[PDB]
Amino acid sequence: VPLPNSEQFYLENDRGEPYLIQVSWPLHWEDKQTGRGPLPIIYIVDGNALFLTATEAAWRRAAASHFAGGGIIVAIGYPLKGKLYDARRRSFDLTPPTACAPVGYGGADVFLDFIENSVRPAVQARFPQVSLAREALYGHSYGGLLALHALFTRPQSFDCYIASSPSIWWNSLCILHEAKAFVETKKQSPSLMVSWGSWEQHPPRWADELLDHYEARKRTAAELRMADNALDLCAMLHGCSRLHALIKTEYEGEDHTSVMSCSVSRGLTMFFEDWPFHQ
Amino acid sequence: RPTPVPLPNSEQFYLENDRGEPYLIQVSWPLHWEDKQTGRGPLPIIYIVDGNALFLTATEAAWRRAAASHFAGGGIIVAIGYPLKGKLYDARRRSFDLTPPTACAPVGYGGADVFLDFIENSVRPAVQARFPQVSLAREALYGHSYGGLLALHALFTRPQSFDCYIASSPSIWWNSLCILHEAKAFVETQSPSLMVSWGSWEQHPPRWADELLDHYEARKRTAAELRMADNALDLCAMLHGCSRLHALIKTEYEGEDHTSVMSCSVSRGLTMFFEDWPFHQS
């Protein structure tokens, strides 16, 4: 039995690389044509890994009291079989260009161009009767790095950026350069949502785990520095002229993988129902 | 030419209870399996009530664990829902199925024992039949709101029925805190584990944008009466140092409401039960 009120299709970028675009719309709709007028839309990178959660989370909002009509979910993924991630494809698509970056990295701007010039029009054609009230870009890990990169380099492209556990550590904190250029530049501003799990930088010991293995995980966690890097960036963006609102959340007892469920669920909830955010 | 979205490594089937009331059972298994009959040996299983609302989240969250370091083959998801179209809840059915029996309960309530019997005597065998080569290593019961009230009711009245009980934002308020009677009886008389959770904005909701004060005060009135966080903490406090409880985990999710927290609790629930068993003696 297929998912209700959803569809998927393949788009190729300008270089002939395929993408699986998965789309869902409010469950109470009979057809796609049911929806009229302005609706919010969210674009989710690593689409395969999060489409179903974001879809069901959006449907669950129908029962909530602050439901305003819902919005369109767009998951941008890859053709996969028996797994949720394409390590090779995402490594290029989600990381910004740098001089010292190894091969198969630094294709963020190519991928963002694809989203704006291919995915957005394609989805808009599937809903001719509706207009895009506002657009959100969600990503987790390298996806979050892409979200931050998109904000700092093309802030007008999207209304809201949602960086779930962003890989700020990547490439000797290259994103902090762009963050500095963003704040130092002086000039409606978009919003930013940052989040991370509490067990990312400070993980507890597993039931089966021994000391050496645990110490190795702690050393890794310390190097990646998920929470502190995010706070450093958030403190850096505090009182910025080019940013309307900045929301930051720490999810208690959540690891890098588990927090994805929380961040994507709240991300679209806030964006759909609680727009605009207070300063 | 767009197509419908297929859900891989999953199937659904309908079951009747003894009373002849229909249920939609939705099952999923690890994504890396070629077939349903790929897996063998002991695997953990989680039963999720209000199945329609939580199946896809639990399914995909379980699949996401494959990428994590602490993956141990995964487990089986079982969502116990209803035949529905255009919504994720059946208010009438769930009102009966998820609430315990009391003398002062209105019409259409107090059918928890009927539903729990259905889970043990119908759902469990039906799932076991579909996975012959799999043995049920351990069983968890998850529920949210009334579902959490059912999970607590199940723990206090039939503790040996499941190994782990996960109560997400349990409706302890229901029927003048009638669950506290069962809770008191339980403590006063190995052991199963309990996972309790709630959202921070449930009992203390912030004001929405362009919300009239009158409307906001009405929401605060409800929040105060339902007393989600305090009731849960009060119940947890009572159960602490109980002989018939191995471990008790309690979490509060920052900036989460009654609906949104469901995503977190179900994800946390299956994660810990699948990967971090057995729990520390807390």
Ligand SMILES: *[C@](O)(OCC/C(C)=C\C(=O)N(C)O)[C@H](CCCN(O)C(=O)CC)NC(C)=O
């Ligand atoms: C971020 O992208 O984490 C997500 C990793 C995912 C979704 C899948 C995966 O890792 N698979 C299938 O192997 C980054 C990724 C960093 C690159 N990496 O895989 C490393 O191992 C790096 C030491 N990770 C974080 C923690 O931000």
Ligand SMILES: [Fe+3]
């Ligand atoms: Fe890796």
Ligand SMILES: [Fe+3]
């Ligand atoms: Fe209600």
